[PDB]
Amino acid sequence: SGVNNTKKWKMEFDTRERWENPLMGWSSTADPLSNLVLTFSTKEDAVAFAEKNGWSFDVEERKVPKPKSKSYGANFSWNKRTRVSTK
Amino acid sequence: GALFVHRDTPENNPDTPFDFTPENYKRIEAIVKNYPEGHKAAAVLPVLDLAQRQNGWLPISAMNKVAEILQVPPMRVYEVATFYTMYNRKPVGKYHIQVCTTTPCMLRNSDSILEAIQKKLGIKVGETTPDKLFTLIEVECLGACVNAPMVQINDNYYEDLTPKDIEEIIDELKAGKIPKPGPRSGRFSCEPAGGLTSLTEPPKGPGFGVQAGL
Amino acid sequence: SNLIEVFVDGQSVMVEPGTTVLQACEKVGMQIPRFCYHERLSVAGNCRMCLVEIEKAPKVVAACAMPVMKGWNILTNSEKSKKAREGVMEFLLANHPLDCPICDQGGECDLQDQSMMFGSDRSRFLEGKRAVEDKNIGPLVKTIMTRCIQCTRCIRFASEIAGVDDLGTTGRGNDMQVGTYIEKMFMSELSGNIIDICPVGALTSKPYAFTARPWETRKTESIDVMDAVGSNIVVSTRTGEVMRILPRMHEDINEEWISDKTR
Amino acid sequence: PKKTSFGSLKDEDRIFTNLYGRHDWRLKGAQSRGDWYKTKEILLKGPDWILGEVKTSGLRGRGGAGFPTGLKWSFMNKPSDGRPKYLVVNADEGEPGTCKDREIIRHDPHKLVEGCLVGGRAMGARAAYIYIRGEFYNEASNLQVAIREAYEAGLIGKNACGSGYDFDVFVVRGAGAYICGEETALIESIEGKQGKPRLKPPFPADVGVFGCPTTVANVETVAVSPTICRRGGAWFASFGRERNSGTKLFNISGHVNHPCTVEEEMSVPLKELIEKHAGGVIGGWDNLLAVIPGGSSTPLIPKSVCETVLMDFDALVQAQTGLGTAAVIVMDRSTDIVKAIARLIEFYKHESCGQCTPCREGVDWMNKVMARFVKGDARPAEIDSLWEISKQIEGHTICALGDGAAWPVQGLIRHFRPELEERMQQFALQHQ
Amino acid sequence: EPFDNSTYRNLQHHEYSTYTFLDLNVELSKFRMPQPSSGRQSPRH
């Protein structure tokens, strides 16, 4: 339920081939850049970071929580069906 | 019996043949009419009470049958049954002994009463007689704490009750005769034992202290 | 317009009338500790960890169900508010079994994270612990009721979200056994999401049981293709394979729920 | 004007003149006492009169709430919102020490139901939903016959007491609990639900049951309403001190020679009630070690503080306790105060509904640590530890049972502290 | 008629059958006003 992760921007890459080591069943990987993510407060700096080294670039807009119209008396109604069946 | 999960036993199973006698449908329809339509879940309490006064317990079959006759999901029936005290899901031995054990009663030594029906009847707390007459449980206050340690037998309680008073109460009880409920001593309902103090002069007439039109 | 004015530990903020204290806190960025309230799952008010003291209060208000009005300074970091959180959490944690090494919730458990942020650093318990008998409601989600803290988040989820009335809290006192009382099964098409709403390891996925731990699971963002709904989901990958699938936050498509087939 | 010598309640001063059921408890004796008279007039006078009469009456919360009922009955007195208004009488009486309403329900139910209808006019309700206790089966049938003789006579029902008023009164016999004693868990018991204290707001006033406005009152509080509205609220308010206006059916029990639920003049020192009306206590004033003042939730009071204090709401509050339901329980030196509240706190654990964690977890934790206290299996710092958690569950609970559990142990800690230390000293000494 | 001091007139509490509360319950339906309607007869409807 905590949200102290939905507040920054990251710099994740595309995953590449991950094969098992013949001896010990590792995850030998030839992608040097796979295990690297940056942290950006806002977004246009994150993109401003993106083009200055010229990486293939796309974004995703922040899925902001819509305001949930909460209530407690709705669970005890007279006509509306929001009467809770257990408490 | 201290088991809030239901074991599917061959006797108490959803296949157990529970139903209502012709009078009950008049009784349970009297339950539903007492409340406004739209919210008739209120009847889950007295309908389950009706089964208490017919089967002597609440088999899982009774709760399941209550579900559709109440137009409620079966679990809401279980929740009502499992919480409240004498909604017993387990067979009981004819007469249910509810000895009042809470502090005001034990202060006048409910343990003497508890020891009295313990040794005389010969079964431990929460158990039943070998041939199903008595079941003693150490209940708390039912609402008569002023009197001596209480015993609530089935539906009729016995107050102002002494350990010597308890053995004679169950003396006739095992013979089938029910004793008079209420305070067992000379106290009738709530007057002091050493003579009544209040309620001396006749009550005032019908209507007093008129405030003009009133 | 009609947005009533109110303070939050100092700074003031306008807010729609009828809004509860919790929903007024995050307007500035306050995630007040909660354990029985989900923003899209009714309002319970039983965990009492949302308890925050209002200004000039004689008693701590339950931020979940208290509608706020004019001039109520939310005393978030107040001593009493932290005192209320400290006491109420130790009560939750009191009967909690010592299963963190063996519980899959370890590493992503709200009970663990809360105790790190808003919690003590030792124990004052010197008694035994409650032992709730386990249940069985399907092969898709495990049931360990000793770890439960009776947040009742499941029974609301079944009642409204899943539309099925098969969860409840039988018993009394310390003996709040949340389950089905009778032997029953729970395979609603959204019954798989019952895992995520559970703040503890009481409900966990049998297929994912004892397979991975949260810190190693690299996360990726993808879509559901089991159904034409195209639900947004996050795929867990560790050491080069997939273990479990979680629904993503998308109010339009899936909210935070996915079908059992997808999970 | 101010009769500081409060006491010696007269029979007319007892609004329940048949609370003992000595004379005809049925409808045939009710109108003889003064019931069912002039009621037609007071209903036709309008709701403001009962509100006006109860203002000078000053009848406070007699169910342990300790709130002036004149305000609460007028709290929700608003024009019709479409949703019908209802009434509820808190006939639970599950406290270990509450018996007066049990006597009232068994012997004086007609003035109770009349109180519902005269009150129902005040709050504009159309039906009463008194929650009679399930264990009270015999007295349940007692007010159903009281229900019977009143409905066909026009006193209650359609044209309630002949005033163009459709107020009714329904009965819900319980199935056993104390949590349903509090109104917020009481309502769910009627509302086809297991007893769970509802969170306020929404309050019972604006929306009580099935989503409609409802009023919750203690049995006597509505029962005294027609009596105070007939003879005069100021006469009722004469009894007791400021905001202690009125009398109370004191529930004398415990180590007392003649326990009796006596409707006696209220705001009176306990020395008078134990001796004059209860015929002394077991062993006298010397014998008694402490007394439960007015209820199990109210912390017990020892002889050191209860040597002079008057049994009134205000003096009880400053006595670090409450008068509550006037459930006075006497207890002597022979009984141990720890074993006394041991059974009391065990009963609290046997009741808690488990909704909010402080009551669900703390009370059981209280039971385990206090069980050690009976023998003495705790170090001296545990009393402070027990005090700490007692403050932790105080007020933090959804309902008042959680603090209702804090007060008795809190009072025991502050009063018999050396007793705990020496009992623990004997524990380690005998088990060295 | 004269005021009594040692007479209990509540013998009915002793002589109440098992269904006595139900016996009065089934038959006070005559004095019943039309119960309020919720716009529907159940909150799952």
Ligand SMILES: Cc1cc2nc3c(=O)[nH]c(=O)nc-3n(C[C@H](O)[C@H](O)[C@H](O)COP(=O)(O)O)c2cc1C
């Ligand atoms: C645990 C608990 C038990 C209660 N039991 C009762 C009861 O048995 N009878 C009662 O009248 N009030 C009881 N109350 C008080 C009610 O919550 C409520 O304050 C009361 O019915 C108000 O009555 P009044 O409106 O006449 O003042 C209880 C409260 C608590 C917290």
Ligand code: SF4
């Ligand atoms: S649910 Fe959380 S606190 Fe409980 S055992 Fe699992 S990780 Fe530990």
Ligand code: SF4
């Ligand atoms: S099992 Fe989980 S979701 Fe269900 S009540 Fe317990 S903690 Fe809440």
Ligand code: SF4
């Ligand atoms: S204090 Fe909390 S757990 Fe106890 S009865 Fe009240 S709501 Fe239930």
Ligand code: FES
């Ligand atoms: S003390 Fe015996 S009934 Fe409460």
Ligand code: FES
């Ligand atoms: S959020 Fe208020 S109690 Fe869980």
Ligand SMILES: [K+]
């Ligand atoms: K979980």
